[PDB]
């Protein structure tokens, strides 16, 4: 009565959704990852800084 097929199916749902998100926003995340730090500095906040 393992009934793990439901658990494995949930894992598939999560993992296929992850793959779909990778396809959807893979390029955007790759372009964001090398210059993420900029988000911490907002132009006017640079003067207030």
């Amino acid at each position: 009565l393992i009934d793990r097929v439901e658990e494995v199916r949930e894992e598939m749902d999560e993992a296929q959704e992850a793959a779909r998100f990778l396809q959807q926003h893979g390029s955007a995340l790759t372009k964001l990852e090398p210059m993420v730090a900029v988000l911490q500095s907002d132009p006017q906040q640079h003067e207030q800084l």
Binding site: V8, A19, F21, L22, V36, L39
Partner: protein
């Protein structure tokens, strides 16, 4: 900034677990075939019991 940090935190996990879909796919195919066999065995057991 915080949203981007969280997104870059999750994204490697997403990439890490995406490849497991296909290994998971055969896993559930085998598991469900096993469950079909288990259901058949249970049905046949009950069938003879009487």
């Amino acid at each position: 900034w915080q949203s981007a940090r969280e997104l870059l935190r999750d994204w490697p996990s997403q990439r890490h677990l995406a490849d497991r879909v296909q290994p998971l796919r055969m896993r559930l195919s085998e598991l469900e075939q096993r469950l079909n066999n288990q259901q058949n065995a249970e049905r046949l057991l009950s069938e003879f019991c009487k």
